[PDB]
Structure 1
Amino acid sequence: MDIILGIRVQDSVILASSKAVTRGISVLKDSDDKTRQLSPHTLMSFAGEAGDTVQFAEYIQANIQLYSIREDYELSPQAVSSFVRQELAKSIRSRRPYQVNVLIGGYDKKKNKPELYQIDYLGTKVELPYGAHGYSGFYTFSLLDHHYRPDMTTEEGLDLLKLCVQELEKRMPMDFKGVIVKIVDKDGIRQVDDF
Structure 2
Amino acid sequence: MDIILGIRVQDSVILASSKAVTRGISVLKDSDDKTRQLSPHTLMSFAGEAGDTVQFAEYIQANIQLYSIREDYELSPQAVSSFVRQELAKSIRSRRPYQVNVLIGGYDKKKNKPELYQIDYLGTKVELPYGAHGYSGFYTFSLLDHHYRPDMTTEEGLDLLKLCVQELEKRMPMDFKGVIVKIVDKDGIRQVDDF
Shorter-chain TM-score range = over 0.9
CA deviations over 1:24-68 (Å, ceiling 9, x no partner): 110000000000000000000000000000000000000000000
Superposition deviation, residue 110 in structure 1: 0.2
CA distance in 1, matches of 2:79, 2:85: 10
3-state DSSP of counterpart to 1:149? coil
Matches within 5 A, 1:15-94: 15-94=15-94
Q: How many residues align?
A: 195
CA deviations over 1:83-136 (Å, ceiling 9, x no partner): 000000000000000000000000000000000000000000000000000001
Percent of aligned positions that are identical: 100
Superposition deviation, residue 6 in structure 1: 0.1
CA distance in 2, matches of 1:78, 1:24: 38
TM-score (norm 2): 1.00
Superposition deviation, residue 13 in structure 1: 0.1
CA distance in 2, matches of 1:141, 1:76: 26
CA distance in 2, matches of 1:78, 1:112: 13
Runs (4+) off by over 6 Å: none
CA distance in 1, matches of 2:147, 2:112: 24
Superposition deviation, residue 142 in structure 1: 1.2
Superposition deviation, residue 162 in structure 1: 0.2
Q: RMSD between aligned alpha carbons?
A: 0.3
3-state DSSP of counterpart to 1:135? helix
CA distance in 1, matches of 2:69, 2:54: 22
CA distance in 2, matches of 1:115, 1:140: 19
CA deviations over 1:149-179 (Å, ceiling 9, x no partner): 1100000000000000000000000000000
The equivalent of 2:139 in structure 1 is: 139
Superposition deviation, residue 143 in structure 1: 1.1
**Structure 2: stretches of 5+ with no match in the other structure:** none
